[PDB]
């Protein structure tokens, strides 16, 4: 176990589950591999609205409250603002409307899905407006924390110096894996204050919507098969590592009952300094989200990487 203090007080485990699935699985797969991660010892589940699948999240929590495994207060449950809900007066109807399907009374987290506002095609929004009407969200009690993702530091920056600004977004979560490190934002984010979690921390599910098939394979990377066998753990497990010494909150999905077992074991190793160095080396600028659906917005969180 372990987790990390919030900028608000709250804390949030450091390894998490991820529950997105394409389509293609069925909805019922989420339920069963929620109770899963839990009964591994996962206590923190990343879903969103966008995910579709968020009744069956919920009632895997609700499930594991019922029969005596875990109490709601042991559970870090996020969600996510759909990017055509940031119109302000949508946002907290929107965290209602998460709630009802998960059958829960608050969220431990909520973020900002994307800063790549889409009409409810693209859209123009002040999101610094959408983040006051976030802090309401956290006032009410809807949620503990509230926190964005997928922003820049530019992005973040522009909430961080608000007129007025109340609460600080607790993190930021982002791509970032050995072949898209985000150095510097993580730098910037502990400066401040901020939790960086990564998602597609194993090299994302390289769906076809999103995902050039013709990129390399994180897990197939030389250095991690290498990593794994002198620690005779698996690559994923060695980039999982990776994050947590690098002080990142990592997510990690699936839908496999070996897997979800083994992504625990994270807290059972540890990397050395020439280790952590070998990974730092694999860092290529890879985003694995390359889409003409986003690439061309306005707020396109990778054209200041330059
Ligand atoms: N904020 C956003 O915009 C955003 C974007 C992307 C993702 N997310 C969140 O981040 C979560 C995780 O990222 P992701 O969905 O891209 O997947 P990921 O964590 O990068 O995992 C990618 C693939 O790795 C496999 N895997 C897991 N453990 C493994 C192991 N020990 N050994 C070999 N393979 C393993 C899984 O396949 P199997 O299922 O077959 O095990 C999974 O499909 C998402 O589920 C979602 O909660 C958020
Ligand atoms: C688990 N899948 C998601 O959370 C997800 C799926 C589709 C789109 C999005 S997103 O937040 O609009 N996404 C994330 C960031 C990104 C970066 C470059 C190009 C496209 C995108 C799109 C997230």
Known sequence: HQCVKLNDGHFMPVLGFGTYAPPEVPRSKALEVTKL????????????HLYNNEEQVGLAIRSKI????????????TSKLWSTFHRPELVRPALENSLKKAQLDYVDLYLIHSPMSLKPIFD???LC????????????????????????????????????????????????????????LLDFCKSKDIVLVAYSALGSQRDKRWVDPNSPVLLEDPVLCALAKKHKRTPALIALRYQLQRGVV??????????????????????????????????????????????????????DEY
Not at 37 to 46: L, M, S
């Open 129 to 184: 407006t959408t983040w006051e009407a976030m802090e309401k969200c956290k006032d009410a009690g809807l949620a503990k924390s509230i926190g964005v993702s997928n922003f820049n530091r530019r992005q973040l920056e522009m909430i961080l110096n608000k007129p007025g600004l109340k609460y600080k977004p607790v993190c930021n979560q982002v791509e970032c894996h050995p072949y898209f490190n985000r150095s510097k």
């Open 124 to 126: 123009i929004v002040d």
């Open 66 to 77: 019922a029969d005596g495994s875990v109490k709601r207060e042991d559970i870090f449950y």
């Open 37 to 48: 991660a839990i009964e591994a010892g996962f206590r923190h589940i990343d879903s969103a």
């Open 250 to 303: 990592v997510l990690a999905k699936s839908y496999n009952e070996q897997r979800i077992r083994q992504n625990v074991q994270v807290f059972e190793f540890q990397l050395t300094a020439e280790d952590m160095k070998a990974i730092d080396g694999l860092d290529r600028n890879l985003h694995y989200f390359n889409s003409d659906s986003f690439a061309s917005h306005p707020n396109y969180p990778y054209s």
